Amino acid sequence: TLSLQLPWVEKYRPQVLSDIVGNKETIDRLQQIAKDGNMPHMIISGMPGIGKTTSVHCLAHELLGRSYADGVLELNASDDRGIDVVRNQIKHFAQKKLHLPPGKHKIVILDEADSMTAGAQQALRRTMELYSNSTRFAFACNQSNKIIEPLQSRCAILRYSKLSDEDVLKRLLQIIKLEDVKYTNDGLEAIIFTAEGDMRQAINNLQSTVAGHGLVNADNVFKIVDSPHPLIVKKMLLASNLEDSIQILRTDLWKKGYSSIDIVTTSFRVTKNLAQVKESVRLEMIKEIGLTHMRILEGVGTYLQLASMLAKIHKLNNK
Amino acid sequence: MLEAKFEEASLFKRIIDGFKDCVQLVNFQCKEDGIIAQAVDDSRVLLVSLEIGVEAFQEYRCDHPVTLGMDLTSLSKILRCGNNTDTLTLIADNTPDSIILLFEDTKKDRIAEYSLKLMDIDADFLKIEELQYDSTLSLPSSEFSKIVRDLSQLSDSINIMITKETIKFVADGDIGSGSVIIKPFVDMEHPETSIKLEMDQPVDLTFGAKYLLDIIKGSSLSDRVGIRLSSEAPALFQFDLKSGFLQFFLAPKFNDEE
Amino acid sequence: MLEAKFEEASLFKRIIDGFKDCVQLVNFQCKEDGIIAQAVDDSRVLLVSLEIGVEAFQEYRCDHPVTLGMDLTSLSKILRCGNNTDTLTLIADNTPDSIILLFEDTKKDRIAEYSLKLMDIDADFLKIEELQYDSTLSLPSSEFSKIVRDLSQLSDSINIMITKETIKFVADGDIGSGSVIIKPFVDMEHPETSIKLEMDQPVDLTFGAKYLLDIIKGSSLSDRVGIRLSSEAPALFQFDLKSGFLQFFLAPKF
Amino acid sequence: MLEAKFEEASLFKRIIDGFKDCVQLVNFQCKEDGIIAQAVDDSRVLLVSLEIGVEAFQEYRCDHPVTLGMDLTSLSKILRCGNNTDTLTLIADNTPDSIILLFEDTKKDRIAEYSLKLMDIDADFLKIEELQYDSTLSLPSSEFSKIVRDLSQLSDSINIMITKETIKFVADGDIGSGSVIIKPFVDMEHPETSIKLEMDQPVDLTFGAKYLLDIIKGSSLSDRVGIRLSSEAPALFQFDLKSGFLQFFLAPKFNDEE
Amino acid sequence: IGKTSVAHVIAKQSGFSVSEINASDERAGPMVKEKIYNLLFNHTFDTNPVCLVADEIDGSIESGFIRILVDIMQSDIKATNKLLYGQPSKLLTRPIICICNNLYAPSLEKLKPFCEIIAVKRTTLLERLNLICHKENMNIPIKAINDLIDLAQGDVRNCINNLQFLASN
Numbered sequence A: 001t002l003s004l005q006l007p008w009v010e011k012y013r014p015q016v017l018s019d020i021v022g023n024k025e026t027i028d029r030l031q032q033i034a035k036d037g038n039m040p041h042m043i044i045s046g047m048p049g050i051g052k053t054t055s056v057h058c059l060a061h062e063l064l065g066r067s068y069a070d071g072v073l074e075l076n077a078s079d080d081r082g083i084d085v086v087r088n089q090i091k092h093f094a095q096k097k098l099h100l101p102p103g104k105h106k107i108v109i110l111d112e113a114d115s116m117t118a119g120a121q122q123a124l125r126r127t128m129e130l131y132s133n134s135t136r137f138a139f140a141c142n143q144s145n146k147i148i149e150p151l152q153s154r155c156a157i158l159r160y161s162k163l164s165d166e167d168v169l170k171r172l173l174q175i176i177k178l179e180d181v182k183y184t185n186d187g188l189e190a191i192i193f194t195a196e197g198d199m200r201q202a203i204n205n206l207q208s209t210v211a212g213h214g215l216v217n218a219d220n221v222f223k224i225v226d227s228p229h230p231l232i233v234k235k236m237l238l239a240s241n242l243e244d245s246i247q248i249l250r251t252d253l254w255k256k257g258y259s260s261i262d263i264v265t266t267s268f269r270v271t272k273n274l275a276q277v278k279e280s281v282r283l284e285m286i287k288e289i290g291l292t293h294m295r296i297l298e299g300v301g302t303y304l305q306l307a308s309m310l311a312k313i314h315k316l317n318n319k
Numbered sequence B, D: 001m002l003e004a005k006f007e008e009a010s011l012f013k014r015i016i017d018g019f020k021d022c023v024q025l026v027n028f029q030c031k032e033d034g035i036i037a038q039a040v041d042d043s044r045v046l047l048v049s050l051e052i053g054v055e056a057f058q059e060y061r062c063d064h065p066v067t068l069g070m071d072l073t074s075l076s077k078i079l080r081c082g083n084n085t086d087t088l089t090l091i092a093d094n095t096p097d098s099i100i101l102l103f104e105d106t107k108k109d110r111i112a113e114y115s116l117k118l119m120d121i122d123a124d125f126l127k128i129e130e131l132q133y134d135s136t137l138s139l140p141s142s143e144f145s146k147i148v149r150d151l152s153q154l155s156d157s158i159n160i161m162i163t164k165e166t167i168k169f170v171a172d173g174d175i176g177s178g179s180v181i182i183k184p185f186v187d188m189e190h191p192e193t194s195i196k197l198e199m200d201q202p203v204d205l206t207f208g209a210k211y212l213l214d215i216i217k218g219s220s221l222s223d224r225v226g227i228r229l230s231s232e233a234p235a236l237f238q239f240d241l242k243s244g245f246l247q248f249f250l251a252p253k254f255n256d257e258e
Numbered sequence C: 001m002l003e004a005k006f007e008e009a010s011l012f013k014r015i016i017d018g019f020k021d022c023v024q025l026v027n028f029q030c031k032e033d034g035i036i037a038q039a040v041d042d043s044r045v046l047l048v049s050l051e052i053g054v055e056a057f058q059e060y061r062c063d064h065p066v067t068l069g070m071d072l073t074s075l076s077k078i079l080r081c082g083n084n085t086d087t088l089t090l091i092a093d094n095t096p097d098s099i100i101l102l103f104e105d106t107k108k109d110r111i112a113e114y115s116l117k118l119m120d121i122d123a124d125f126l127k128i129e130e131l132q133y134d135s136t137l138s139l140p141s142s143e144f145s146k147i148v149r150d151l152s153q154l155s156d157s158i159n160i161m162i163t164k165e166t167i168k169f170v171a172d173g174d175i176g177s178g179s180v181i182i183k184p185f186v187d188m189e190h191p192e193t194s195i196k197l198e199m200d201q202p203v204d205l206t207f208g209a210k211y212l213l214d215i216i217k218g219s220s221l222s223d224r225v226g227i228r229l230s231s232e233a234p235a236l237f238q239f240d241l242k243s244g245f246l247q248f249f250l251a252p253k254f
Numbered sequence E: 001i002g003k004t005s006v007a008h009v010i011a012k013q014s015g016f017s018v019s020e021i022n023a024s025d026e027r028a029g030p031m032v033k034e035k036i037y038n039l040l041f042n043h044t045f046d047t048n049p050v051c052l053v054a055d056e057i058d059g060s061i062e063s064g065f066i067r068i069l070v071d072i073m074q075s076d077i078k079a080t081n082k083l084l085y086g087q088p089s090k091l092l093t094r095p096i097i098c099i100c101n102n103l104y105a106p107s108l109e110k111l112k113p114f115c116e117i118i119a120v121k122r123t124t125l126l127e128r129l130n131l132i133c134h135k136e137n138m139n140i141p142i143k144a145i146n147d148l149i150d151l152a153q154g155d156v157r158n159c160i161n162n163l164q165f166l167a168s169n
Ligand SMILES: Nc1ncnc2c1ncn2[C@@H]1O[C@H](COP(=O)(O)OP(=O)(O)OP(O)(O)=S)[C@@H](O)[C@H]1O
Pocket: A008, A009, A010, A012, A013, A014, A019, A020, A021, A022, A047, A048, A049, A050, A051, A052, A053, A054, A055, A141, A142, A171, A199, A200, A203
């Protein structure tokens, strides 16, 4: 081996706002903005792998044309983004003179805005306020609550949502048509099921299954990829009889190499996000999952502790 | 346009050393009779004001004044390439986004050129200098530096008191008190060491030691320092240049005011 | 065994000053024709390579090569006892657990002797030097240091560009941009100040300023520095010694 | 009362440099035959003892001994005003609450005067010096400093071993071991570089390197250092002054005792 | 509730140029002193007389700002009495508006006797946003503006940014 090929997430990364199968409303909004111009300060929030960075990249590219190289300032979490950088480099870029069309503006893209320190975020306020006629700011984050309210007050808020089954299925069908891959309906269904609204993870699993077996079938997808860890945990907690839950925990989780910490933590998440049972029984199950945890963290993490946690949860559900 | 060539990059480097630390933003303006620059610290108790006449340069051309603001720190960062003996030329167009510093050695050999990004500052030069001050005195600047360096250790406030034929610097704090008393005198063996004093009215003002410490830097530009004090305005500490001067105006402490 | 006596402890101290900071582990090997040493930084972008021939020593004896690895920091910690004028003798047996540094003054008077613990490093000396480089240039090392010290303030990257009869160093960052342009020239009034350049092909490479800053230290070992650049390999910055040389190979950016 | 004038403020500044860092409180006492001072560190392994005879001063007057204690840090903070060449006068009444340091230049010109607050310390001067020590040696103090600075890097303990005609300093720690061996010798080309040794009994003591490092400061007061060692008491390192001496008594490590 | 906005609008409506000072940020009354004295006694380059608006006066932990205002008031009372009763001094010719959250703050006890006290009770934001909508030619239903005010919790800056984002769409 001498060199590798580009992954399908990067190779087929959308370069035009029409290729994005994300939230239709915000996509058409950004398309009309790039068509008319006058892009305002924006903050795009959501979950990983739904088309946030690609969306702002496509918007900046379409809005700047060939001037993207000298009119767009990209700053990721991999670069220093402290108070000194905001004071010197961002201010020098915002004060920089640049002849642009009468409908465009310089764009400052800040990826992972939820990781910037409080001082830099505070200094960015007047930085974006005094140069709001020749410099525009686009933040891309996962938690909008991590950005201070003064910064959110000077910008639009775009909350991206999970991708429905239809959109990811359409994108995967387009990728298969562009790549000439042998597939089947159940295989694509299993891929979308294991993706959980994550387009990047879906394309990655598809490419991995293709390069590992060639045929995208549910058997191959399940043998190479793991059935959503949370679903087996939910089926274990929602069991009606103790022996069924014990057998599930033994075979599916413990005999496959899942650590006790992952089991208990996944267990907590499933419960917190549960809606089948009432609030009080959910709180009692969370209490039992957490007292056990307190023992799991102390190094007493074994199968007996999880079995006792399940027994206590069933006793709580035993009226 | 801006086109000013200093014989020795060293002069400009020492001038900027004077603005250094005590101010962040400086507003320069070149014109037909030279270059001026003003910088005010954040608390607004210190104003640094420069004037360099046409004759201080080896070559100066100006057919159209240009005003330009910049970050002092950025400027000094770049101001250590002068080799001191290098030639320095400041260059800028009539509507600049940058200021070009061009250092060249006598021979064509090595040419260090910088393009510093400018800041937009609302042009608002102050003209706070007074016609007459209560008292005026000059003395060797190295002596003034020592006086300031002594007292500084004792307090954050240094008082300057002037009475007929007497100048007294005083500091009083936790560990105790100190004072330096100097008297006017003409030394013919070399008058650059004399201490002159013209008092129209006794004065007694207090200044924040941190600021006087910033001001003493001017010693590197002139052998003597002129100090003009008034109960009506900021004090003036001045360091003369060949065709020019560097001035520091410092507001007296009200009771607590630097 | 290892038995190498330096006339002046100062030479060894300056040599080690060159490895200092930029590398942590150094692998020395003494043999019949002298001593060599190699050290690679953690990111593997810089290789420091030394060669000291037999003639650089006042006394050198080797009937059996010895390879020894050590922590650079530990070595420099001990390398400030040379009085510079002291005599320094490096000593080690054929299967050493330590390296002995022996500093002595002319008279029997004062004898400072150290026994430095060695580290085991898999012997794997690199031989990455090229036959021909795209361009070759030498200039006073103090001049090169100034050039690097200037530009460093502006950016974390300094570009070196070579065209016929022109060498240009450039840095461009937040506060602005800077450049230093030098031209080849022979100064007969003293040729140690000349600037030579042999260009077979124009080159244009970018280096991390932090590394060039580590490299300039070699000025203390030689009046001139040789710089060899290629688009096919790490750049070579070389500082000649009397019978020997200190070389820094630096991988260009992307 | 206390009235001691040093010709050069520098001598006092170097003396205090010796107490500096290693001790916090110093107890001075002036009397008819001079000034003495003692300071003990918190762990009580080091005693710094000073003696300045009447002849070391340009003017000394004492008709009534005065004992005064003070914070060393406060004193040094004030001890950088001497210009070294300034004249220094220590002044205090018979029942002082402060000590006055008066620095004056030859001419009436500048007078820096300090009033340092005193601390109350129970007078309890120690007299731990021995009649005879197991071994005695002197050598250039710069040489002793180098010896200490070498070994210090290797360990927190430096051992001094003495046998007939042999003095050996040794340190052994993590990175390895080191030793400095010196031999007695008379250099007529200048005897201030000689290394004398009088051994009545071989000695072998260990000291905490951090303390020896504090002690080497005395080099600035004398060309030579005298080291007296005993297995029965703290070691004595002595730096002679013109009419006086600065002594450091250091307790050997028991196995772990500085 | 719009205390700052009401002070600004009424001062501008009365033909005054408004100069705002945040009293909590200015930790140098004795220095600020020069700013306040220049703003009260020097002619501005503007044709319009200056009105001083001091915001957050209850946040000044150091009584410097309030002492300066009290000293200015006492100096003007002494100067007025000299004009009334003086047989043959900078008079205050400019209005001062101060804004606090707490009236019974200990720092304000000395200032209260010189002040006309006005309570602003808990609509004004809706009126302002409607005026912005009308000037930007945006036909927004009053219901959606109320829902935006409720979303923004009475933050005027957040309201205007959300309105600007609705306009771009
Ligand atoms: N709507 C979409 N249409 C097509 N491909 C998409 C879409 N969303 C994501 N992708 C793919 O996922 C890759 C990465 O998308 P990103 O925008 O980087 O994910 P993200 O939404 O920004 O979440 P992060 O970066 O983890 S916070 C892209 O290069 C595409 O290949």
